[PDB]
Amino acid sequence: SMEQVAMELRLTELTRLLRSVLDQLQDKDPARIFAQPVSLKEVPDYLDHIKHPMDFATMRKRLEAQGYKNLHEFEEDFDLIIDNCMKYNARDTVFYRAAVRLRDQGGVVLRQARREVDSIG
């Protein structure tokens, strides 16, 4: 149907906007602390602590399969990145501090993205 195509074009355009949001968020992580999944070889107990691991590469795989239906879903995954880190790592660690900084900086980007998704439909 023509409606299914129009829907798919909106999904595609949202994917376009989310890809740019993702690139901007990731730039707020120049150390690359959040680039890849936490290694279960190197942190063998990780899943006893963290039930839903997340990282920028796993987000990007989902993104490219057009797996985010709305901004809310994408923000849920960004928030897991930050929130998982702030639970597993103590306040006085480079990891925790990197998450705080990503959260604070990411907020700006996400605030305008919500306006753009509402604005462009």
From Swiss-Prot:
Tissue expression as described in the entry: Highly expressed in testis.
Subcellular location: Nucleus; Chromosome
Crosslink (Glycyl lysine isopeptide (Lys-Gly) (interchain with G-Cter in SUMO2)) position: 41
Domain Bromo span(s) in chain numbering: 9-113
Assembly and interaction partners: Component of some HBO1 complex composed of KAT7/HBO1, MEAF6, ING4 and BRD1/BRPF2. Component of the MOZ/MORF complex composed at least of ING5, KAT6A, KAT6B, MEAF6 and one of BRPF1, BRD1/BRPF2 and BRPF3. Interacts (via PHD-type zinc finger domain) with unmodified histone H3. Interacts (via PWWP domain) with dimethylated and trimethylated 'Lys-79' on histone H3.
Function: Scaffold subunit of various histone acetyltransferase (HAT) complexes, such as the MOZ/MORF and HBO1 complexes, that acts as a regulator of hematopoiesis. Plays a key role in HBO1 complex by directing KAT7/HBO1 specificity towards histone H3 'Lys-14' acetylation (H3K14ac), thereby promoting erythroid differentiation.
Name of the protein: Bromodomain-containing protein 1
Species in which this protein is naturally found: Homo sapiens
Gene assigned in the entry: BRD1
